[PDB]
Symmetry: D3
Amino acid sequence: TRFRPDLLSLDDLDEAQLHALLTLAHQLKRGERVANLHGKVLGLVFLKASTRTRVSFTVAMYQLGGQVIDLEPVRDTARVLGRYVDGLAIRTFAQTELEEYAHYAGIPVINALTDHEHPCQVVADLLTIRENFGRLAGLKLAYVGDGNNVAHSLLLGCAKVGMSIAVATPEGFTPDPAVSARASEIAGRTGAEVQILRDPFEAARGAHILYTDVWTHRLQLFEQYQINAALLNCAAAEAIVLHCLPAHRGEEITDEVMEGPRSRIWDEAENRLHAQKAVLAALMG
Amino acid sequence: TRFRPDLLSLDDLDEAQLHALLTLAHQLKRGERVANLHGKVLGLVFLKASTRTRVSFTVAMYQLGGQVIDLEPVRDTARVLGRYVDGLAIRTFAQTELEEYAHYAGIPVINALTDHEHPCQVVADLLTIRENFGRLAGLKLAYVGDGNNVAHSLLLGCAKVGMSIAVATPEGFTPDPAVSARASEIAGRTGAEVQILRDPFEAARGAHILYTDVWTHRLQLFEQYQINAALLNCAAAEAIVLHCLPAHRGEEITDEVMEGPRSRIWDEAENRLHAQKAVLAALMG
Amino acid sequence: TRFRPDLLSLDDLDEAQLHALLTLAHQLKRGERVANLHGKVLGLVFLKASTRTRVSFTVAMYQLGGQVIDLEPVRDTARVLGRYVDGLAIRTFAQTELEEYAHYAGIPVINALTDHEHPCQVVADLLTIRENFGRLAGLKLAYVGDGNNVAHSLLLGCAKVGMSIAVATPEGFTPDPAVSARASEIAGRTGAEVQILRDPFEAARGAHILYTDVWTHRLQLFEQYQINAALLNCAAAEAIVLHCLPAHRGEEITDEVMEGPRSRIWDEAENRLHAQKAVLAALMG
Amino acid sequence: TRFRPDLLSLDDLDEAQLHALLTLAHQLKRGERVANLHGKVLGLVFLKASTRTRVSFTVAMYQLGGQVIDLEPVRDTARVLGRYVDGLAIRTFAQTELEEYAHYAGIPVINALTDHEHPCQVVADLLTIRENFGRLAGLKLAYVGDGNNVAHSLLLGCAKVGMSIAVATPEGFTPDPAVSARASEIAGRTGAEVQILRDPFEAARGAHILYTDVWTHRLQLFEQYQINAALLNCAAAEAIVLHCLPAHRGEEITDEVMEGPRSRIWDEAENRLHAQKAVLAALMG
Amino acid sequence: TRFRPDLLSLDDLDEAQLHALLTLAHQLKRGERVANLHGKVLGLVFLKASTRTRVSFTVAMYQLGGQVIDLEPVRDTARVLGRYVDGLAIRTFAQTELEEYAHYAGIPVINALTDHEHPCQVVADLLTIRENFGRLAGLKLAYVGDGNNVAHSLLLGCAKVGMSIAVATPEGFTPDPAVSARASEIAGRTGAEVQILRDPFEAARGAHILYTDVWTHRLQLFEQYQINAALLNCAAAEAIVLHCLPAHRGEEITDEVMEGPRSRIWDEAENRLHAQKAVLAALMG
Amino acid sequence: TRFRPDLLSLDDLDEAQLHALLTLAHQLKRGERVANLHGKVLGLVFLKASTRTRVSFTVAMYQLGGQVIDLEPVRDTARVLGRYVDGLAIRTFAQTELEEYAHYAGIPVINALTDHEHPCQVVADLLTIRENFGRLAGLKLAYVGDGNNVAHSLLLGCAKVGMSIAVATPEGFTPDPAVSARASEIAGRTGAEVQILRDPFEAARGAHILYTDVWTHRLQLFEQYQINAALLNCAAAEAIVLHCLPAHRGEEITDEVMEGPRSRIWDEAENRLHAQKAVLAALMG
């Protein structure tokens, strides 16, 4: 399978590319296949610190046998960096800045995280879901909280693998309507339902996965959007709980649920490494 | 007219005390009367800078002939301060910490600003409105934006003067239910009607005064509450526009209206000086 | 009686001068006498911020009818300052730097606080003791804790007024040997006794005043010097408790004693005002 | 003699106004005349700290019987400030910003110091020179160093009083051509000669006043522009040395000269107060 | 032999384990043996930056063929870290925090330094002592200074290999009585003696090693504990001088001794690398 | 050819050593040669951050198969570092401090950049010029801007390969006369000519390479020293434009030229890597 040069948005992967990437991630993780980026160097440019993201990308590159380095107009820094390293994993606020790097770098650019999307988190999430249910299509994912970057990637990711998704948020914090429309377009072709709503318990109905993230009056506004025992009980019988981290116990989730038997948060976190190894191999391999 | 020792909340004043304070303010402003705090010192304790609040309080004391000074458990600092100065104008975050100083100070304490209320700002606003319509009772005030500290004082103040008030705030940014309840409790005995709405135009229609403050997805949630030409045209023909300041042109208000012939912002700002002179004379006199 | 132009060390005043100063402070406080510094300005140059010291000096000058201003080689800044204001209350770390200012300023310099001494605090303490015993000579004062700047000024001050003093501190926290020797030399002619000890209960035995200050392993080294009920019971029946402030309840003193009937801490703090009015009038008069 | 509302640049004063101001400064200094701004408040807004400047302005207002206070689009800040205080002394970097304030304040604005000029310093200098030589016109002033803000105000000041002036600076550090051109234009009417040169000895030849300020490679560049014994030897017999302070001994001036008998730096420094009193009285009187 | 999973305290190693560790360190150093941690990654979590500690740990892992990465409730970050890396070397303040990591990480944890202990430093010191004397048991080590983290590890380390130890510190800065008691308990079985004294000269007598570290009145309190030619002269004829670094010449040691022929400070420093390679190999191997 | 232990100044390489280095870099770049520093660690001590320098040095060492680590009196830190790593690439401000390290480290020290020189940059530039004209001798290099560290290294470097160099700078920003003298002395034996001029259009006439860097009143001094279309037109027809970066478009260079067809800036930047690999190989080989 051929991949586009960069991974700036999950929408850079069509259904075929995403499934190929997910299969590779599984194979690499299980030792069924091996990849190597020996002699290659991954550059990390985070306009904002993120140890979590730095360590997962770095160990991922080390296990591929490569090296890593943590790192004026962007076109200048991008062009020179394109002369030293072989890949760039970058975190910036503006999706547009990320795109400028990809435009001048001359080497593969990977979205480590922007205000708009977080493609790698969701590839790791899809990985975790598949390992828990032995499938992705037909499942239902309920995301409660702020319609943010992870919500955006989830909308695209779920739709691309035929998974239904219900995104429940407070009135003024809905996901970008253009992304939700893009996700519906995709879902129409994979047989999935895409829903953007207000009530979390309605989104949770029948959900196999409950997903949340940190919240952006604060209390009154998001309080109902918390994955707790009540939300869990109202979801599919074998529901699982995901959270991209870090978590604020008492806000979007309870300690009880987080430390509960339905939590797959730690496996989800590990998969960040396995997912990113697949992308690094697919784009730099 | 006996006033309570401190002015922590606008509710420390009954309808009579408020009107008395307002009358005193008017007279002092027009020289129709004279006060003198010579020999006394006003201590300012702002846990959060506020040049605007500091300058209006300081000049207010100077015109009364007093002096000013800008300034471990609060009980300790408050007791020692009560031995050096004769009054405290303080700005804290918690309304309780303010009550803390008031409890141990042994000298009058005035709320210069807290997360919960802004009494002095409203007395100023009531003064400005009075000067613009020759009355307060029967008028309708419409507040749009975040249900914050000034909205709280506005509710209590308007009610106490027989001024009807309609506060329109976004979904999860409603005024504290307890203050609005209390305002309605006062409204019934004064003849004004307290409305807490969601729709800004509903509140502005018929309004004699359009009032707004700075806002707490951000845009998505506040755009409709901006006071502009469209909203102005809805209120009374001779409606006035107030804004406690500082203002963000383009958000809660437009440059057009702010610099427009309906704006009373600058006179409103000046009345902070006269309003506070009245509060200082009343409690330290 | 005539005073040296400055007050850098309590040793700047001999027996006659310190008594003259205390008498002036008493009369000023009772109004038995009056002073005036109208047209004069006091410059406050505090290298280290201190609201407690700032407020007492500023109100002190205000009650004398003067003004106040809160504030490169020191000889340059001192000579220029000496051309604008009429006196400086300065707080530095090094006694030497303080003397630097006094040498070039050309106007009276007062030690608002240095690592080495705190003469104004003690003048206020002596006033407080006098207001509780009707005399100074013959009394016994016990200082427990760290032999710091206040302890130094107490050694000198007590010695000069015929008050016996016992300072109890941990092994390596004794007061400057040179100040102790100088105090003993003064006491030798005033009939006072000077004791630099290790045992707090020994020092407190029959003391008329129990004095402590904030402390400089730390716990397991000062814990025994805490003025609590037990230590108070070792003191004379009419014993008084002083603390220059701020206080750390649970450490050098307990809330019980601090808030108890033997405490004169708040009168002591107020006396900083009356004490400083005395020095300002005496040096700037 | 009527004065323009503000003093943003020394050019805001024509020959008549500058002379009336110096005369008033002298009269007030000698007590030959008295002025009062009782009831008025001077606002100080220094975007850049400047103790020397803050103290000289504050004592100036105090001696005039007024009060002073130390203190978002500037047009808002200025308009509200204009409702509380009676005058503003501001120190900023950009001259335009200063003009923004003057445009919106509605009250007198005085340039406490900007990157472009330092008028109050030069009125103090002119006052000092007048007291030393008994006149101003016909005298010659040599300024050596960086063509900065004080250099600009000196070019204007000297020209206006008919004092000839020679400013020697390193090639790329000449003063603003526009101010020089403006100074030459003024000098034509007053019979003074303006010279912008390179060689400091040429500039100092027959000068009655040697003036310097702090400099901006750097050493070799400004090294020769130092007022030392040698430079002083090329100037007039009764030559005096001025320096606006602070000074960097060893660079623009030597300790020997600075502390020598030809120095009038401290008198010059004190005249800031007397000059500023005249500016306050003249614009706020 | 077998080792406990973590090295949080030197007491985590019984006599056989410490010796096995010292032996391994020596063999790795002389190349008499080899080891590698290829494909493994060491995570560094230093809550208090330490470049010297970071470089020694990082180069140790590199020479073992592994990689290194420098890196919310601790239990959350520990569990996530445990899914990415194979070992953690951490620097915290609280020993208990260090224990939190070990409990949740799921991978070996090494104490890179805490307020309570510094085991890796002591293993390095032991290696150094052994190389200089050809043995450990029967020797006498004198530690002078503050009874801190290294003193605690020295107490346990020394007793464990049969080395007698005398720790001299000021009255209030003695080592944790519990570690001393534990060390004396171990010494009873190894034939060594443990002494906690006050006098540095008494401690240093007959000592083969003089050891000090940065100190916590300051001078008056610690001065006597300084290791200088005088103290060195009281030690055994072949006495060596150790210091964990960094050093403050003039305080705990003099430049003279530190640069003298009896100093083994640099070899001790180098051994940080050799001792740490041994712990990494032993716990991650 | 044998090299000295360090590369602190370009003058540490005679003409013969410079060519060998340049040849090694080229061979390494084209794969006509292969070096390896396996088992070695390079430490980077940058007293001033420089991602540009850090990345070029780190990827260089990685391509040689070694490791890299980014890292109190210098003599202590140098001695300890010398026990852990095998080489130091360091960035300081003073050349003297750089020498301190080399003196005590006991391991090869490379000048990553100092206020005085930038050797590695120049070896990269030389290698770039060579790749563009197939020769170095006979060619002419014109530098315009501030006579800084790179100008200094270009002077020594150009002369050493027989390349004529003309350096144009404003009057007070000329190259260190000592390096110009030393450059001329070298040129005397290589047959190249060295010129320190004021006019940039003079220096550029007949140049095959126009070189500039960021500039040190600032504009009206460096303004005329911009490499633009006009300046280019005055040089040889096959003229190349070099800039060590970062660049300030509109100041020392125009976007047009930087982005134009004569620019070799990006190739020049990549060559920092190939040049540094040659130094690392040569000095640590």
